[model samples]
Target chain A: IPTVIYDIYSRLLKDRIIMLGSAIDDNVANSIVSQLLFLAAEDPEKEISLYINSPGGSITAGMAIYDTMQFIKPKVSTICIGMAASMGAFLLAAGEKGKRYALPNSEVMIHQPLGGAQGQATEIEIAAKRILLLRDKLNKVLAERTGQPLEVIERDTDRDNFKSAEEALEYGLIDKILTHLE
Target chain B: IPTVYDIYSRLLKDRIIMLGSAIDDNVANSIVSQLLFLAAEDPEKEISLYINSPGGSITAGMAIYDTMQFIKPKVSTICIGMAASMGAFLLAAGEKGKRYALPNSEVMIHQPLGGAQGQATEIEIAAKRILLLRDKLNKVLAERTGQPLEVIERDTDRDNFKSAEEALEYGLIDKILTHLE
Candidate 1:
């Protein structure tokens, strides 16, 4: 029954809507990227809608999807349902400037990358250093995309900065709070 | 518009089937049915199987694997993106010389995950069953890949990931398809 539902939803890929309803991972990233590329290749001028409802996982994996979203010729409209947290929020913010959106009750969150390093001191140090560098890169992206100052973005991301739909719109994380559709 | 979805659906005419998700009973049933249908249409023709799965139920995967072997036509297994766990196992189990992978695809193998819960005796029984299943899987992998049982056991004990080139060298695939040939 679930497989039948999945196949039905998969058919919507032809209509240019992608569901990102799971944690970001290598498998999720690769599948989404493949779909994005295929849609772009089919019709470069068409608009692609990406519906996100993820708790987020794997910065590297999420970045692959983000990069492909930008690399494709079609404009991607990211719609936030449920909650877009961590890297999921980043992708929502990375959508085409005017097309980012959120449902009235949806939420968005941004935060510093969590670490789970274990090994020799030297190995831990290396991991910490890489995470800090990744932190800076992400902060810079949020700053640019949200038109917020780098320091403000850094401060907000110091901890889990969660936002309601209206707050997300005010924070420049989204362009509109969708209340109705034609 | 000549949509990519339309183009992709058209590939079915060429006997191309895609297993691009986790293998469950339904997924296995669908792929096995397709193999049977294609074989019925033309027993001697070739069918291309494109895989990009993260793998799922071992029983479900084995069902598809068994059907592939039972079919009359040669099934050329191709890895387009990634094939991990049981997915990698099936990719490696493809017809000896027909397995192919793209340059950037990844193949991974790992022990079956165990999540037995309940009373002591039930847990013990579950563990014993899983252990036997694991050994059976390892034996088949060793037989198919010509690897020693010990080597297969050691590799499957942990997550062993390989690139396309490495997979080819490890006897997982016959060759890396670089271009249309």
Candidate 2:
């Protein structure tokens, strides 16, 4: 179908649910933030459902969405369907407490920020320092949201840490493992 | 074996043409030919022109625009997504009371952009030509929209974008189609 048809389809579904089915980037993040704001303005008391299935991309873009999710008045219920990795997992965890869910077979993964820095040695060193700062910031967010110790989050995220739906629930990454639609 | 693409293809078999991409010489030629063919087939029937373009060459767009006017049948333009620059001009030029826009469609107008190179005298001539084209467009907009030439000049000096409702208020479109006729 042409994009116009899909655009009309998106409008039909924009009222209550938003889909994040690709890597988080400036364009995707802008659209998500705009939708979040629009929904909040339409009805501040209603809940908004966000379905995420992303491989994750820019941390800056993810942070824009994460902050807007908090700034809006409506409670956001994040659902992990296929998988949520890196910044995607962070956004899933950043949803309203006790409102986050994961499908029975879906997975979540968290790890330190990854990037390949090029240029002079000084520039490479500067890039490494920035990554470390971002790592600390994201780790603190997970620790606060999941009620886990900062040390635990820091240790688990030192490498790629994959968790099943059951493990995510037990680890406080999500509230429940969804088996059927409510 | 029929898909949604086939469905739209069949549905648009009537006197309907889709301008869903940037207008270049080739696009303009195709649309002009389609308009001429449809007019020849049924001179009294209305032609439905669905536009969702970002605009391109001014001269190319002008060819299609002129043909739309030369045709015997009235052209009913429907803006489904966006109509920017020359695209907006054509949308407004649609047979007055027949101009329509979808609820979320955007329309924008601006003066012709200048991108000339080479000798100073040649660049000066290019600038003069662009200014004349801008004046021509502003006059047409003023006459079609029933607005003063000064008002059109001011609005077209920079990118002026309007939503469907806003466009209706600006006299750029006749109606915002929210339901089937």
Candidate 3:
């Protein structure tokens, strides 16, 4: 009966809405960044809603989109409809206050940003340092948004921290719950 | 003249309502009605409700659900330990962005259940009604959490129980406080 996977979402898009529903990878991020820049440049004063449902992939890729989300001039109202896991969780929290949203039964998952290094000893050491820095940068954002202490975040995020909509709001991952269709 | 928030809380501190019993118990319904009346009697201030139950009858829970929507005061809910089954629905249906859970609290939600005593057409109608209630409850959660209907169905396929942190991430509660505050 439905035409598209995000059928209802298409109708909402006429008002300048962007939907992101896939694993966060270079390809996904590249497309997202391109579209975001276009939307922002098209109308700096317009409001843009970004509906996201991703399991997360490629920290670097997520960063590309995340940075663009902040860089864009139009206010981005990010909402999570399914699961915003890993870096996707970070993106959800990155949304401006009063704009971030997660629907009921939706989930937000956070954990230590992990990556590996493969090369000579010195090369591996340098890579480790870079990963640590990146992790810190990501965690800093999480700490600021969730209102949790940096140390507390470090400990909680050491493992998977999946929060429900209510939990996400309390944790500062989202500002509100979408209780209505509109 | 309205006092500041601190003074206001002090004046209305004892207004806390506790919903601890199973809904199948008659006392549970009585308590809901009695407390709801008190909530109605007061108009200016807010009320905090604490829930810790294994859940019970849908009709009984729906009664309180109706009253909670009917009352004038802002009704905030806090889960002390666990809010399961029908209890979970009440906690979810509480005032938006006003629900809370203790650090170790848990929440559970599953498919709507039914039990019909009569035979033939009566049982069939009860089954139909149960199905409708289930759909409505699921829709309420979907609307509130921003998930599609099918996603809710998949997630709620079983006796899905989540920790306080998990519940928070799932969009079931608003916050996870360390204490009753």
Candidate 4:
């Protein structure tokens, strides 16, 4: 074949490392979920390192990726190198226990989900109900992942909860403060 | 005493720097300073430079381009998503044989996009400087890519957009990396 000498991804595939650098919108989320499923199928028992640095977008999308992380066949270990805010923090927490990590200066942020609904009365009501459900689900997962009580989670997430790697560790949001990839 | 964690992290570390913003004075200063540290720490070592930028000031890009050349470390450039205009300058200016782009990445090369504000004389000076920088950059690209200066200038006369594959074909990058290694 006259193709270039190397497929950089093939080397990464052999090593099972994936990077998620874009926003967590539906399109990016679906792509990542599909990539994870394919990697999981490649070797069910192998560990896949997901390096993330997202500003975060679309909570519904983040949740989809989060759910797939759990449903996948392989153990997904997440490593954060840049700022991982909002739903990015959720995905970080969603990584395999004791496998969530952040580079020394990386930051993670969590906040109460935000959205708006304006239309007919019935539509507003449905939107409100959906918001409540999503909030509850997010809070439950946050509490479970961080070992904080639901009440504490609620209070802390009432506004933005930004943390450095050290602060995130203290808050039980990550397993360790990584200095570099080992 | 330095802990094993610190030592190992220092020695085995592959510094991952993100240049995802437009090239401006601030970005140029920050990146050059980081490269200085990296160069000082490991002159003989190789460092990966990840770029995802829409490109900005040619002056700022020139600062980074010069620093990348001045530094002793080998720069293995990687484009994550898009590297356009001045960003393309840096990508192409990276150490020969080490430039890489993701399969879906976009690379754009064009004559310097310039602007001038203020009095006529000052604007004229700025325009002249832009032309000179553009000329120098085009020549550098020619030398780096082993292409003729006219060919480089012609291709860059407008927004010469290239997919990773096209870039590989054009000799703008050494390889199209589909995954991280």
Candidate 5:
């Protein structure tokens, strides 16, 4: 039934609209954005807007979402809701202008990437370098959106700690503040 | 100017029903497969289709025509017009089912990426890959349309070939064969 929310919202979603749920269920994948071949037919006059309520998913998966929106001829609008934690934060920051936000109840978090790999000491050092690069990438997105100095964001998000709605808004971590209703 | 002809819509589900003679640059990219988003939104419900086009450029510069119909809920049909060049291939391949041909239409197949790109090597590599992959991907649409693989491959490439009427006879596309007149 929850997936139905995705289906219904998407089914009626016009070319002027885009997809924006954080759920990575098959319905969203097999039937929604992934299934979409062209963001629009051949008209730049048409724009598709994307919204986000996700905590973020796989990085590769997020890449697809960003690419689909970026490939469009016209334009795309994006908003962040719920918990745009970790990689979710990365995506929210990647949207076009007027893009960024979270509900008063929502939250966002950031940190370096962590995982395992098989190799020697050199490999471990390389892994550390990759983590630094990824952190820089996150810093780039954040700096572009929040106008915060990279130095400040870099020191604060060294760990995968959560950023509350107020803190995020105050720090320029988000573009706007959203309430339960208008 | 010519774009007015290519638009087709069911008006019920708001489908992309493109069918016209001469397609231009702008419509070729934006107007063509926008319906696919609809189809993607409702895999079991509606769709927007593109018809036969001579092709043109917009952003992404006419990189692809036709919706990902298999991935979509509906289709778009293009008239070969005795030749569907880079323009027509996108229309033809983007269909959910049939690739139609008028009595006097044919198709032309080539490898052109439309606009500029990365360095020449990067561009060439990407272009070759897409060209090859697109041809293969179109095979599924043809199969769904009920044309044999051999026949589709044989007839898909032609600079100046047959007509829509001829295509109907060969089953390359669905009917434009009989008009109520």
Candidate 6:
């Protein structure tokens, strides 16, 4: 298939760091996630550096990748290169210290979770729970990194707040902007 | 560097200054007019941010999130690890008003653009402006704040950021607590 998911893991990547990106609508996270797990299982030493250039994808796959990296052992770094919207942003935060690196003008976005059904109270209820859980997950990472409680980070990312690498660095979102010297 | 997008402050967003762009080309070419700049990378603070990203397309997206206090309430950030390539987030996080990791922490950053090949890339690059770019935002960030973006994205992410709190012990330390100065 053209979008074999784990192609990058098997082919372009080795026992070294891997850097990758995607578009907003691209559904290539599964392949990348699966391949990352396999690579983790095999080389273990093959460091991974995921460069997220996406708007986001499936909830299931995003969580899967998050779980995989949680125990992947080797050094894994996720750099939010561009607009890591929705689940894509969540997955990026899943990185131990997922820091986005963009120019003075790069975009980052996240918001309340959504669902397929537009009506039906049951559907809405289910959607709410799922969204809460997802939001809680996002807060978990934010809390873990920022030292803030779950509620605080939750309140922030939930409303679709965006930050710059410069501002993010200040807010403990990212590391720092890269320059020439150390 | 003038051709490159610089830090942004919206006139419309009075009393506000920040920028955000797609971590790509078309988006990056514009100014980084984001909402707030995290200047504190201290773990002692109540909130921390995580960034996992690629690069911009054509710098098409300037800012998706520019919340002064909505997203991250502070201006300091410490790269936990692996912040590299055209990893824009890790780099811009190191502005002057931002706090940074030091001493026990390692900050690594660099300049490297990723080449994208897809339907989106072609369609977005309609603006006929081209300039030689570099992935030195990390270092530039560090330099602006008197740190090293190189180490922040490179060794820092690689080393998992070491100790975040200890890493951040400087000027913007006040912002570490999840409140604006």
Best by TM-score: 1
Clashes of each: 0, 0, 21, 1, 35, 129
All candidates' chain B TM-scores are: 0.94, 0.93, 0.83, 0.87, 0.51, 0.32
Ordered by TM-score, highest first, the candidates read: 1, 4, 2, 3, 6, 5
* Cα lDDT, model 6, residue B43: 15
Clashes of 5: 35
Poorest lDDT segment (10 consecutive residues) of candidate 5 chain B: B1-10
Docking class of 4: incorrect
Residue-level lDDT tens digits of model 6 in A1-182:
01122222232354343433443232455566666777788877656766555666666666666677777786667656545666666666666664434434444565565556467999888888877777666667667764667776666654445555565566565554532111
Model 1 chain B worst lDDT window (10 residues): B1-10
Fnat of each prediction?
A: 0.00, 0.00, 0.00, 0.00, 0.00, 0.07
Error of 4 at A81 (Å): 1.2
Report the C-alpha lDDT of model 1 over A1-182, residue by residue, as the tens digit.
13353465566776888889989876677567667766776688899999999998877567657766776679899999999999899999989999999998999988999877787886577567757867887788889899999999988888888889999999999999898876
Cα RMSD to the true fold for all candidates = 8.4, 12.5, 20.1, 15.8, 17.7, 19.3
Each candidate's interface RMSD, rounded to one decimal? 8.4, 14.1, 20.3, 15.3, 18.7, 15.9
Q: Model 3 segments beyond 4 Å from truth?
A: A1-12, B1-181
Q: Give the TM-score of candidate 4.
A: 0.54
What is the Å distance of residue B162 in model 4 from its true position? 34
Model 1 alpha-carbon drift over 4 Å, by segment = A1-182, B1-9
lDDT string, candidate 3, B56-78, tens digits: 86545654554465557667888
The model with the greater DockQ, 4 or 5, is 4
Please report, in order, the local distance difference test score of every candidate based on alpha carbons.
0.82, 0.80, 0.73, 0.75, 0.50, 0.44
Candidate 1: pairs in clash? none
